[PDB]
Design a protein around this ligand. Structure first.
Ligand SMILES: *O[C@H]1[C@@H](O)[C@H](n2ccc(=O)[nH]c2=O)O[C@@H]1COP(=O)(O)O
Ligand SMILES: [Mg+2]
Ligand SMILES: [Mg+2]
Ligand SMILES: [Mg+2]
Ligand SMILES: [Mg+2]
Ligand SMILES: [Mg+2]
Ligand SMILES: [Mg+2]
Ligand SMILES: [Mg+2]
Ligand SMILES: [Mg+2]
Lengths: 181, 1635
RNA sequence: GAGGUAGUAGGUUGUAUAGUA
RNA sequence: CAUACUAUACAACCUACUACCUCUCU
């Protein structure tokens, strides 16, 4: 089995001598497959000849021997809107009170109201009064809230208390208008 | 392009005007100013290099630092002028007087310094290029120069006062004294402003759109905008006074003007952009107080956005914009809704206004159903650098390039740009332009208005209240704002800006008044086309009135259709140089309208037009004359269009045709097979046997020639492959030989050699000095012998092959010879009788008594063949005798262990008892079965030997007994053939195959020598058939230097325009009344928007009834007839040239010589060895191949066809000559020529295997067994007929050609043989022999002089075909000397050539060859755009010749390499050495750009930057911005080779001798290493992993990017002008980085 | 001598990609 | 574009040589 059919045919024919005749007769030397064709003989005086085709000459000899063997077998506006809802989820009654009531009145103390709103929406405020003086000779302060992103509002007045109250009123109307939708 | 001709680009227009007179070029860009300054420096240097004159460039940014300026590099890199710029504190070292420097760059104070020293004489200077003089300080420095050198200097002696002042409209200061400022400017520096630039030449020669100023309304300020302004004014004063205790004002200020001029919703949409930018910028704040400031700003923008959104989205987009926006955007939308291709170029002032306009236009386009055709894209300005934060730079780069791509072709109409859209960027032709902001100056007015060139065009400026503060102060919120929160001056600015527009129109009227060339109004053209359209046209096909027609309009539109369609590059705009001029005749004004054509065109004379009353009538009739002369000289076809690339028709009768055989015509007209001329198609050709070997068998009585096959060992086989250690057997000493008996004489043939088991043996054929008369019994004796030798001894007889003793094909006899004992060789008759005595004899199985009879003989088995009779009975294997062994016995030791002694072995295996025990033994080796001894067995064809056997196996096979083969001499039969004769017999078939091949090559040589007198016909022996054997940072500075002349320029044309020096109001008021009453100001409440005899009499009032006669119109020949009669009547027409002197003078006033030719008269022709080599395909696996002869033959083919296409067609340009060469060189043509002249059947195309691919002599194949799928009867029918008696008596099972008589051969291989035979004839019998071979094949490439045959011509002067029915030969002559293109349309064209060729003697010394006809040199240098060349043609069609000359020179030199390159190492040593980059590098290195004449800006800049980067490299060979190559300079390198070829009586030796000194050291440098090319290396070292992508378009519009993708190693990108240079540089950077 | 490997070296043809003019 | 000269990678086939295996020969 490990012997090739060429050598199988040679072994089978070796029982009476004989030198086989192998002749490549017909190649189709075509454009991409060179196909070879041999022809196997059996003596020139008395009595066998088969043909064999293949792609390679070793396979042509093998097929000829086989034939002879068988023949033999944008998103920042979305951030703005998300800021609007994360200020909206603080649903206390102070926001509705600031919306319904006209806020011309400045008699309220704004610092406790902004503290209530900051604790309502889990925020905290920080006052920074600038020690340096303006050209108008009045105090100025800025208030910071831990928002998304963090925000700073403004206030100024002849006293530091006036500046703080102005910034606080700014925060009050601020939270009023971003509780208006 | 219609009625105005086509304008030159403004640089050479300013060059021509400043050539004409003194000129203040009011040009902004310093690069174009430097190009213009360079060009007039070299032109008035050419005028100045006559008696010795100097031209200066007194300058102000020169003489403090020691570095050369930009003009120094510009002028000493790109000219031959030795500039001597004054370094700071010149000491003028030694004797260095200023005469011997052409350009003499200075400082104004330095110029007076040598003016008072009397060194630089003001008479002797030819040009004074005073630099930028539109400023006060430079004027005050220049005042001592011209206050003190105007009075002593007459204007005759005063030179040209070219002065490169700034752009006039943004120059100095104010508006009232503007005209007086320019007036004092020209009166001081003695000049005239001649400002003809892109600011001007869009107004002049291009369309002028009807511009409209529209007032919208002032913004009546509503409650939303009141509340928003209250909030922003509340925080503005707060931001104004910020502090820090241990930027945002600009973004809180500029938001308010959006509210002031565009409205509240736009304020929201701009505050969103500002909010995103502020949240981008506020995170990186390192300061606590600034962090609070930016948080204040961001949250204020938040509350404004949410307030506006809650305003117009809870209480409520066309109506939304209508109610909550400014009237300015309503006017914008009205303007856009009036329109329904549109290309809109809206501008802005600030980069945020563009984006809120982007949101507005997108929202209206996606909401309003009317304006669905609005594709919006936007851009900002550029500020930052790639050095800092490259992420933002690359993101902006990729965004802006995509935006400009979308706007570029047809997709995006509205492009709401900013100030980067004025200079630089090239954009499509605009239809409607809406300048949103009022223009800052006239610059932004017409670098936005003066770009719209389509003319249904409107330039609309929306205007409003000006930029003024609407702020109220530091107040807090108001009561009305609290109520809104809880519950929910046109005339002044318009008058001042209409005054501003009147000032711009005064500016543009001033600019037009300073133009040299005046323009008629459009009412003149309307009058002309209304009145005078009754002149007869030109109809060259006048019988049918539907075709050819040149009227008044088509004529002026049909010279801009001819000059554009011409050979030109991107550095060349082609145009006709029109000139009007005036005269008065019979009391009327007439205008002669002279034209000129591009020097690219072969209409090389002016068409001097005929007068007309107006100027546009003169223009239209001069274009009539141009079209008429164009078609009469032949450039036009019957449709009056230029001929075009394909449409050229050959005139010589041998050419055109190109009709193949019908077998090839059917495939080339059907297009369904593999294409002919290619290797894809296959054809089977019959193996043509020799003439001398067909029908040649000797008969009883005919004395036949005898030809011994004389063999001789030359190289014995070295013992390293002698694995058996056998004896060396030289066939020279062998007693028995072989011979050929034939009846047709074999010619002299080349002694080849075969490689057999004894080494190399040379094979010859030698005659018998006595002829042999052969009887009738000996005929059947030789007939027995041939059957024995080629059927039994060597066994080559196939089943489909039989011995035919009366045959036609392969019909030669073979005889066994023998050396005579007394000396000499003869035929072995006793041996043939002995051979005939025993035929195909069965070897005799002898009994025991015969072996017992006689003992061993040590003389029988010397030179014996020892086949054994006990095995292989019917046909035994034949063993040689190698050694006789007395040291072995039949009773001696066995090799193996399985058997005892040799005698014992022979009884146990078969049964042959050996009756002699004292006998010696025989060591044998097998006979040959691979009969092909053509190739060397142990060596390659490069020469380096293959490995031989190891010493272990060789010593084992020479010593050990388990190897080898051993036979007893009493049990074997000696064959009648001795072993020496068996070796000659087994080497016979290669001798006969090679002798048939050499005879086929001799047959081809005989055929051509019979036809065209090319070689001898019959006969010295041929030569033998032999087989053959940091700085890179210093880089950036130079590049930065180039960008320096752009860089400051941008800033210099953005902000300053400063420094004024020291009737108008009435015109301003008139223009104000015109702009207010003429509808050009739209107010703020309306919407936007004759008898033929008398006509001929007024048409030419300078008799008319006779010329008119009875017909309707007038003929043009009649018109020039009346003008010629008026010339003969009235003396002269002395002329006033209304606004050229630019061109003038025509309308004015033995080491391997490459061309070695042997004497073709009396020549033997080429040797059949090298014709065999040229006929040997590469599939032959032989020691000879055509493939090194094909690549020299192909290059000679291309060279010779290029030369003949140049000589015959002296008027056609290269664009169709390349088409003719591609017709006459293509492998279809060479294949059809080869098939016509019998070349498919003369080639070898297979490895010669004699058991499969050979007819032995006197054997015959019936040629029918292959198509089929006793022997005496088979004989008698196979001479009669095949098919009728044949019928009477791993795919494609119909299998093609039988292998013995045919060989499958592709078409392109026949083309390869065509080229190979051209090369073979070239190498042997010269270039003329190659040319006559191509004429023999069918490509006729030489002239014909048909002369009468001179009475048996005898000498047969070669290339002269056989006479036809009359005694007339057709002798081919040498190539003709062509026409030198010194076109004598000028009366002194030789002196004009000497004047325009000034100072090229440095170039001649840089090349060596002194030209004898220098017009070729000028034709080689001259670009297609060097318009003052009224002497020759351009350089394209001569580069066409020079490229082919250089390709042949390179491939013939590199073929002559002793290294013996492959076809691939001949291509790759050429295609890496004739390349545009390396051509440009030797051009720059050897001083070619220093003598290249052109008048193109972009080519000058490209040439400058490339010479800079080359001079920093010592002339050696983000984004990957590399320097572009001057393709023009590589083409100059080709074209100078062409001009040296043509000027030298057409010899390649002088071209090679000149080009060796440049190219040949560099040639050895390539010839050692392996150069390749950057794209080729990057796809070679990365054989599959590189993948190049589709193009992307940059923002600039003249740059492409590439993006190499080297897979899993790095993605790299580079930029360049076109795809080729950009792809080369991107792959080059990939190569440079992946090392 | 025949067959199976393995390597080196020569090619030829097809496919894909690409150079140079 | 087109048209000559072709390169690399991969695939198939043929050919020369070298070393070892199985059979045969010896
Ligand atoms: O069987 C081959 C080999 O044994 C024999 N041979 C013997 C001696 C020598 O020096 N060389 C040699 O090749 O020849 C037989 C066939 O080989 P070729 O077909 O001729 O290569
Ligand atoms: Mg052999
Ligand atoms: Mg090839
Ligand atoms: Mg060719
Ligand atoms: Mg070829
Ligand atoms: Mg062998
Ligand atoms: Mg190889
Ligand atoms: Mg080219
Ligand atoms: Mg190739």
């Amino acid at each position: 089995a490990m012997k090739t059919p060429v050598s199988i045919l040679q072994e089978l024919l070796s029982r009476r001598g004989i030198t086989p005749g192998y002749e490549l007769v017909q190649i189709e030397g075509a454009i991409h497959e060179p196909t070879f064709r041999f022809r196997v003989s059996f003596k020139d005086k008395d009595t066998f000849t088969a043909m064999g085709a293949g792609r390679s000459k070793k396979e042509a000899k093998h097929a000829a021997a086989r034939a002879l063997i068988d023949k033999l077998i944008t998103q920042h506006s979305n951030k703005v809107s998300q800021f609007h809802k994360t200020l909206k989820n603080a649903t206390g009654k102070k926001l509705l009170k600031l919306q319904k009531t006209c806020l011309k009145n400045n008699k309220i103390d704004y610092i406790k109201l902004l503290g209530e709103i900051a604790t309502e929406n889990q925020f905290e405020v920080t006052y920074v009064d600038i020690e340096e003086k303006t050209f108008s000779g009045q105090f100025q302060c800025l208030v910071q809230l831990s928002t998304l992103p963090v925000g700073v509002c403004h206030g100024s007045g002849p006293t530091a208390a006036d500046a703080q109250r102005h910034a606080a009123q700014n925060a009050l109307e601020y939270l009023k208008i971003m509780t208006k939708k | 392009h219609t009625t105005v001709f086509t304008p030159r680009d403004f640089q050479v227009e300013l060059l021509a005007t400043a050539y004409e007179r003194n000129t203040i070029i009011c040009l902004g860009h310093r690069s174009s100013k430097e190009f213009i300054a360079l060009k007039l420096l070299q032109e008035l240097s050419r005028r100045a290099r006559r008696h010795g004159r100097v031209s200066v460039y007194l300058s102000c940014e020169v003489g403090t630092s020691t570095e050369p300026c930009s003009i120094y590099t510009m002028l000493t890199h790109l000219t031959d002028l030795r500039v001597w710029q004054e370094q700071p504190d010149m000491q003028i070292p030694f004797d260095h007087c200023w005469t011997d420097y052409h350009v003499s760059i200075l400082r104004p104070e330095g110029f007076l310094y040598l003016l008072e020293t009397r060194e630089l004489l003001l008479s002797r200077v030819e040009l004074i290029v005073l630099e930028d003089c539109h400023d006060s300080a430079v004027y005050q420095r220049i005042r001592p120069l011209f206050e003190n050198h105007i009075m002593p200097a007459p204007p005759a002696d005063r030179p040209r006062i070219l002065g490169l002042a700034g752009p006039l409209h943004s120059a100095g200061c104010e508006l009232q004294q503007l005209s007086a400022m320019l007036a004092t400017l020209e009166q001081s520096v003695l000049c005239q402003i001649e400002s003809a630039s892109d600011i001007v030449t869009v107004l002049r020669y291009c369309s002028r759109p009807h511009e409209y100023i529209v007032q919208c309304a002032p913004f009546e300020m509503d409650e939303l905008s009141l509340v928003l302004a209250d909030v922003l004014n509340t925080h503005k004063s707060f931001l104004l006074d910020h502090r820090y205790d241990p930027d945002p004002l600009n973004v809180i200020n500029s938001l308010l003007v959006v509210l002031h001029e565009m409205g509240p919703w736009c304020t929201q949409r701009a505050a969103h952009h500002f909010y995103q930018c502020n949240e981008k910028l506020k995170v990186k704040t390192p300061h606590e107080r600034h962090y609070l400031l930016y948080c204040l700003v961001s949250t204020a923008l938040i509350q404004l956005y949410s307030l506006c959104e809650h305003a117009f989205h809870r209480h409520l987009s066309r109506q939304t914009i209508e109610r909550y926006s400014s009237p300015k955007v309503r006017r914008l939308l009205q303007t856009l809704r009036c329109f329904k291709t549109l290309c809109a170029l809206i501008y802005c002032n600030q980069n945020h206004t563009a984006r809120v306009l982007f949101e507005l236009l997108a929202e209206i386009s996606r909401r309003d159903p009317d304006l669905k055709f609005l594709r919006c894209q936007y851009t900002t300005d550029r500020v930052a650098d790639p050095t800092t934060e490259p992420k933002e730079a690359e993101l902006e780069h990729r965004r802006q390039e995509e935006v400009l791509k979308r706007f570029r072709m047809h997709d995006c109409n509205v492009l709401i740009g900013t100030s980067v859209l004025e200079e630089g960027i090239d954009v499509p032709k605009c239809n409607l332009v809406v300048r949103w902001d009022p223009p800052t100056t006239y610059r932004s007015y017409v670098q936005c208005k003066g770009r719209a060139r389509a003319a249904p065009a409107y330039h609309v400026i929306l205007v409003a209240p000006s930029y003024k503060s609407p702020t109220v102060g530091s107040v807090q919120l108001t009561d009305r704002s609290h109520r809104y929160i809880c519950a929910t001056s046109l005339a002044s600015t318009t008058k001042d800006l209409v005054h501003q527009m009147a000032q711009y129109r005064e500016i543009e009227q001033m600019l037009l008044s300073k133009c040299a060339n005046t323009e008629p109004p459009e009412q003149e053209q309307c009058e002309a086309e209304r009145f005078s359209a009754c002149l007869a046209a030109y109809r060259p096909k006048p019988h049918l009135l539907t075709g050819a027609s040149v009227d008044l309009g088509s004529a002026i539109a049909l010279v801009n259709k001819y000059c554009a369609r011409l050979p030109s590059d991107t550095f060349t705009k082609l145009t006709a140089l029109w000139r009007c001029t005036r005269n008065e005749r019979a009391g009327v004004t007439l205008f002669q309208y002279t034209l000129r054509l591009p020097i690219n065109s072969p209409l090389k004379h002016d068409i001097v037009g005929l007068p007309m009353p107006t100027q546009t009538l003169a223009r239209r009739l001069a274009a009539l004359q141009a079209c008429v002369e164009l078609h009469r000289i032949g450039e036009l076809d019957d449709q009056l269009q230029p001929i075009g690339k394909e449409g050229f028709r050959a005139l010589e009768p041998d050419w055109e045709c190109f009709e193949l055989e019908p077998e090839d015509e059917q495939i080339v007209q059907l297009s369904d097979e593999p294409r002919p001329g290619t290797t894809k198609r296959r054809q089977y050709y019959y193996k043509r046997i020799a003439s001398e070997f067909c029908d040649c068998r000797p008969v009883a009585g005919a004395p036949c020639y005898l030809y011994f096959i004389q063999l001789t060992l030359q190289c014995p086989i070295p013992e390293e492959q002698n694995t058996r250690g056998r004896k060396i057997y030289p066939p020279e000493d062998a007693q028995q030989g072989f011979g050929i008996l034939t009846t047709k004489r074999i010619p002299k043939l080349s002694a080849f050699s075969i490689f057999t088991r004894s080494g190399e043996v040379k094979v010859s054929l030698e005659l018998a000095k006595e002829r042999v008369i052969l009887t009738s019994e000996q005929i059947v004796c030789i007939n027995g012998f041939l059957n024995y030798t080629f059927t039994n001894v060597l066994r080559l007889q196939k089943f489909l092959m039989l011995f035919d003793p009366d045959s036609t094909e392969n019909c030669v006899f073979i005889v066994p010879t023998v050396k005579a004992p007394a000396g000499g060789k003869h035929i072995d008759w006793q041996f043939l009788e002995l051979i005939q005595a025993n035929g195909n004899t069965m070897p005799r199985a002898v009994p025991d008594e015969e072996r017992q009879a006689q003992p061993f003989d040590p003389q029988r088995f010397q030179d014996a063949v020892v086949m054994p009779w006990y095995r292989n009975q019917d046909q035994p294997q034949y063993f040689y005798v190698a050694e006789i062994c007395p040291h072995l016995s039949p009773l001696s030791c066995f090799p193996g262990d399985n058997y005892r002694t040799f005698k014992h072995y022979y009884l146990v295996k078969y049964g042959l008892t050996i009756q002699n025990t004292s006998q010696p033994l025989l060591d044998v080796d097998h006979t040959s079965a691979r009969l092909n001894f053509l190739t060397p067995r142990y060596v390659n064809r490069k020469g380096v030997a293959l490995p031989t056997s190891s010493e272990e196996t060789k010593r084992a096979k020479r010593e050990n007994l388990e190897q080898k083969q051993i036979l007893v001499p009493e049990l074997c039969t000696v064959h009648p053939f001795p072993a020496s004769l068996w070796r000659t017999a087994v080497c016979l078939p290669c001798i006969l195959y090679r002798i048939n091949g050499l005879l086929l090559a001799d047959d081809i040589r005989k055929q051509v020598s019979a036809d065209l007198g090319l070689g001898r016909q019959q006969i010295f022996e041929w030569p033998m058939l032999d087989f053959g054997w940091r700085q890179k940072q210093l880089s950036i500075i130079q590049a930065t230097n180039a960008n320096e002349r752009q860089y400051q320029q941008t800033k210099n044309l953005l902000i300053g325009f400063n420094f004024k020096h020291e009737r108008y109001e009435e015109s301003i008021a008139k223009l104000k009344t015109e702009i207010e009453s003429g509808g050009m100001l739209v107010p703020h409440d309306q919407q936007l928007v004759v008898s033929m005899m008398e006509l001929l009499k007024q048409l030419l009032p300078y008799v008319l009834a006779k010329k008119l006669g009875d017909r309707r119109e007038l003929l043009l020949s009649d018109l020039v007839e009346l003008n010629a009669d008026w010339v003969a009547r009235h003396e002269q027409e002395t002329y006033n040239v209304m606004g050229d002197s630019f061109d003038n003078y025509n309308d004015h006033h033995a080491g391997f010589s490459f061309d070695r030719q042997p004497d073709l008269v009396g020549h033997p022709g080429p040797s059949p060895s090298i014709i065999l080599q040229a006929l040997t395909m590469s599939n032959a696996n032989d020691g000879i191949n055509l493939e090194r002869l094909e690549t020299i033959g192909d290059s000679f083919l291309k060279y010779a066809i290029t030369t003949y296409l140049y000589i015959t067609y002296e008027n056609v340009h290269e664009g169709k000559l390349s088409h003719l060469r591609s017709k006459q060189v293509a492998n279809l043509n060479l294949y059809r020529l080869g098939r016509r002249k019998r070349l498919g059947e003369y080639m070898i195309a297979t490895k010669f295997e004699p058991h499969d691919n050979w007819l032995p002599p006197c054997y015959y194949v019936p040629k029918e067994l292959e198509k089929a799928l006793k022997l005496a009867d088979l004989l008698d029918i196979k001479n009669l007929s095949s098919v009728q008696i044949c019928e009477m008596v791993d795919f494609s099972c119909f299998i093609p050609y039988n292998l013995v008589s045919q060989h499958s051969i592709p078409d392109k291989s026949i083309a390869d043989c065509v080229e190979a035979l051209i090369g073979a004839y070239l190498i042997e019998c010269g270039p003329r022999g190659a040319l006559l071979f191509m004429a023999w094949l069918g490509v006729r490439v030489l002239p014909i002089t048909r002369q009468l045959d001179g009475g048996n011509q005898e000498q047969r002067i070669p290339g002269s075909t056989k006479p036809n029915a009359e005694n007339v030969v057709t002798v081919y002559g040498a190539w003709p000397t062509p026409r030198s293109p010194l076109l004598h349309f000028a009366p002194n064209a030789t002196e004009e050539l000497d004047q325009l060729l000034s100072g090229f003697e440095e170039f001649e010394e840089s090349l060596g060859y002194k030209f004898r006809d220098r017009s070729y040199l000028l034709q080689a240098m001259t670009h297609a755009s060097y318009t003052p060349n009224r002497l020759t043609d351009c350089y394209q069609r001569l580069e066409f010749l020079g490229d082919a000359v250089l390709d042949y020179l390179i491939t013939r030199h590199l073929y002559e390499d002793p290294r013996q390159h492959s076809p691939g190492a001949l291509t790759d040593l050429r295609s890496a050495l004739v390349n545009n980059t390396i051509f440009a590098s030797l051009a720059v290195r050897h001083g070619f750009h220093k003598f290249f004449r052109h008048l193109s800006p972009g080519l000058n800049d490209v040439i400058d930057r490339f010479v800079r980067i080359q001079q920093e490299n010592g002339h050696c060979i983000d984004d990957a911005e590399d320097v572009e190559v001057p393709k023009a300079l590589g083409d100059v390198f080709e074209s100078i080779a062409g001009a040296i070829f043509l000027d030298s009586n057409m010899s390649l030796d002088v071209v090679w001798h000149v080009y060796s000194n440049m190219m040949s050291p560099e040639i050895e440098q390539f010839s050692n290493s392996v150069p390749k090319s950057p794209i080729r290396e990057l796809l070679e070292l990365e054989p599959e992993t590189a993948k190049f992508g589709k193009p992307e378009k940059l923002a600039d519009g003249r740059r492409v990017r590439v993006t190499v993708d080297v897979f899993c190693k790095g993605t790299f990108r580079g930029i360049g002008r076109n795809y080729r240079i950009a792809k080369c540089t991107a792959a080059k950077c990939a190569l440079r980085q992946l090392k």
